[PDB]
Structures are given as C-alpha cells and as structure tokens.
Design a protein around this ligand. Sequence first.
Ligand SMILES: OCc1cccc2c1OCCO2
Ligand SMILES: OCc1cccc2c1OCCO2
Ligand SMILES: [Cl-]
Ligand SMILES: [Cl-]
Ligand SMILES: [Cl-]
Length: 163
Amino acid sequence: GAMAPSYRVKRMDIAKNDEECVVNAANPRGLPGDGVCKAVYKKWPESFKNSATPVGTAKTVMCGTYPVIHAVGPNFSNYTESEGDRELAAAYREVAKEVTRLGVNSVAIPLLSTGVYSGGKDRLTQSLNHLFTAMDSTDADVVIYCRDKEWEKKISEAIQMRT
Ligand SMILES: OCc1cccc2c1OCCO2
Ligand SMILES: OCc1cccc2c1OCCO2
Ligand SMILES: [Cl-]
Ligand SMILES: [Cl-]
Ligand SMILES: [Cl-]
C-alpha cells in the first residue's frame, strides 16, 4: 500500500501515467475503440489479448509486467439512467477488487462513461462519486486523468472538499 493513500488529478494522456497500473475505459469486445481506449491500445496493444468482458466488469491483462485493468462502463445511449447508474457503480467496484488483488501501490484511472458512453450528458459528479465509493477502502495512490481544463478544476475541488 501507499504510505499515506491519496487522490490526485492530472490533465494529460493516461498513456503517459506515472503509476504502477492503468485502468482502460474499455468496450465490452476488447476492440481498439476511440478516446482513452485507443491511446491505451497504442501504448499496450499486448494487453488486448482476450480482454473482452461484460458491462459492469473489469478484466486485467498484463503487458509485460505492467497491468492493464479493462473496465467496461455502460453506454448511456443504450441503458436507462437507473440501470446505467447501477452498471457504472459496479464497474468501479470490480476495479477496486483488481487493484487490491494486484498489490499495486498506485493506479491511473479515467472517469468511466463520461465521453462517448455519456449519452450526451455531463456525468463528472456521477462517475467521480462512484469512483470514490469503490476506491475509498483501497490503499493505492489514485491518480485521475482528464482532458478538459474545467474538469481538472472540478475534480481537484471535489477531492479537496473531502480533505
Ligand atoms: O492536450 C492535453 C491532453 C490531455 C489529455 C489527453 C490528451 C491530451 O493531449 C493529446 C493527447 O491526449
Ligand atoms: O479524449 C479522451 C482521452 C484520450 C486519450 C487519453 C485520455 C483521454 O481522456 C482522459 C485522459 O486520457
Ligand atoms: Cl498529454
Ligand atoms: Cl466513455
Ligand atoms: Cl475530461
């Protein structure tokens, strides 16, 4: 575990993370995809061997000795708000189990279902709160990766509020 487990946020490509493992915002079929998933495919293509897994689950595949945790958030274009919320919560709980099993001291994580799976809604708070519910009981350093400057400020504020 980390000496003083923390949350941090960085605005940069998650493929250039400084953590001991990465969470991919994966699709259920283990395809290269777009956004975070395509950056992860470019950086760790070996991690997409038998990475297909259902919505609401996480499957880890090693790239050398570096773990890639494929986490499948719901596409809110297809799920009801109620069922999508349940699957999004579940995906993060499976990420917490994998992070724990791997024995890493740190993990790089994107906000699941906030891009092309968002169904055109802002889900920063929804996705971040499910991330916290899952990861609060873990002792890994968590570093959240985002693209947008306004999201960086809102994520930083949400972390500092609980402190
Ligand atoms: O530009 C900042 C930035 C932030 C997050 C992800 C990015 C990125 O740049 C292009 C590659 O992907
Ligand atoms: O455009 C989305 C995207 C693409 C590539 C890497 C990213 C990322 O967003 C979160 C931070 O890491
Ligand atoms: Cl970058
Ligand atoms: Cl997404
Ligand atoms: Cl973002």
